[PDB]
């Protein structure tokens with residue numbers, strides 16, 4: 001197909017734009033022809049370019065399986081990714097409308113988006129730097145600190161509840177059809193100075209959502225919408241960085257068709273055909289770094305079996321605090337968690353790191369790394385969490401059901417490791433290693449409900465043999481324990497008839513507590529093997545009471561055991577904790 005070339009430095013918009021030697025100057029020319037982009041067509045932006053007060057909007061077209069539309073860079077890579085910087089200009093603004101109630105949230109209004117994909121299928125967008133900056137908002141994560149006075153550290157915010165919503169990239173389905181085969185790859189999205197509060201406008205680094213094409217006003221609209229579904233399939237977001245954005249880091253799948261998916265909460269189980277029909281299929285979130293989101297880091301909504309792997313989140317919930325979140329109004333929302341699912345079926349969260357979720361000390365009503373929220377079958381495995389301000393894992397309220405949390409390591413997570421506020425049943429927490437410091441404990445104070453804890457190592461990383469509160473409340477049976485290891489405690493859960501007790505973590509693991517305290521400067525995950533391996537303190541030492549002491553687990557959610565946190569096979573009697581002895 002046709003390849004187009006844009007150069008902010010060299011080009012001219014009188015040019016043809018179809019050869020490298022004579023490229024366009026501005027994105028206006030691409031915008032003018034984007035709806036006619038088709039299979040094999042490409043829009044290449046010159047490395048080193050800065051398209052200021054510009055944006056790219058692509059609507060109502062498609063590549064195909066043989067040849068996608070491509071939006072990318074050309075030239076010398078050392079000149080720096082091309083930059084699209086909308087600065088919120090009028091021309092980037094569009095009217096979003098779900099055309100249904102989507103809960104107690106703003107569902108309609110004006111949004112500024114730097115890169116908009118409205119019902120575009122088979123498109124790959126790569127190697128762009130994307131911003132949406134307000135010169136009057138400045139609060140960089142890299143030097144962020146809690147101040148006794150607002151904005152005293154050379155920062156400034158707009159705290160207005162009516163602040164215009166802004167996206168870096170928005171993926172919008174609103175034609176009553178599937179929008180498929182979208183790939184975002186090696187983008188750098190930053191300084192998207194959106195609205196601090198709004199959770200489900202296209203407001204954040206990357207947001208993908210689906211609307212009804214018309215309001216559901218009659219029996220006839222209702223028959224039609226029940227069968228013609230705006231939804232996503234084959235959305236891949238990988239190798240990207242999202243930094244300094246309000247509100248969401250990366251969210252995918254919120255939908256007007258929640259009115260069908262959520263018509264019948266039942267017991268929290270989600271029917272396979274229901275979620276496949278109305279929800280989003282084959283979503284993959286891989287190798288991204290999210291730092292300094294105002295709210296939540298990465299959330300998957302109304303997704304059928306997404307895969308969320310190899311991401312790093314870091315220092316999110318920047319704005320979920322009493323100084324910055326001042327106009328919550330009737331929506332509320334002064335809460336955020338790290339990397340998590342909402343009303344998904346069997347999502348898989350594996351090999352992710354999550355650091356320093358902020359502000360539980362200053363008005364963040366959550367603050368966890370992980371959150372098995374409402375939904376069915378969430379699998380968290382082989383993830384690391386450090387230094388989160390409120391807990392490693394939440395299981396959230398009645399409709400959070402059938403969670404498995406296994407082969408994870410939690411280090412220096414504060415105020416509790418496990419948070420079980422009135423959650424539904426079916427939850428199974430096994431083969432984790434959790435390192436609990438003096439700012440923390442096993443269960444958050446508010447915990448009251450079900451989980452089955454087996455084969456875990458609990459490490460009291462404090463200077464006395466702690467008398468721990470192992471049980472709080474009794475909803476849905478409360479917390480039951482079997483076949484766990486308890487390191488440096490004076491007591492143990494009364495339910496555990498198979499306890500393994502150890503006095504000194506030094507005779508259990510090589511270097512407990514020595515896992516990372518921060519993300520890698522690059523945002524990449526830490527190595528788990530080789531010279532740079534970062535988790536070797538969590539390997540059992542020779543003769544460790546962890547070795548071959550675990551029960552053969554029977555997963556309550558029918559996920560077979562495969563490997564441990566380091567990816568090594570588990571065979572025989574499993575070792576206690578997250579890491580097999582080698």
Ligand SMILES: CC(=O)N[C@@H]1[C@@H](O[C@@H]2O[C@H](CO)[C@H](O)[C@H](O)[C@H]2O)[C@H](O)[C@@H](CO)O[C@H]1O
Nearest residue numbers: 103199301335336337342366373374396397
């Ligand atoms: C059940 C519950 O209250 N969950 C909280 C999350 O809030 C929900 O989040 C979804 C996201 O699609 C909708 O916004 C819904 O209306 C909310 O009730 C909240 O985002 C998380 C993280 O702070 O905490 C849960 O307690």
Ligand SMILES: [Ca+2]
Nearest residue numbers: 133134137138
């Ligand atoms: Ca700014």
Ligand SMILES: [Ca+2]
Nearest residue numbers: 147150151155
């Ligand atoms: Ca501040």
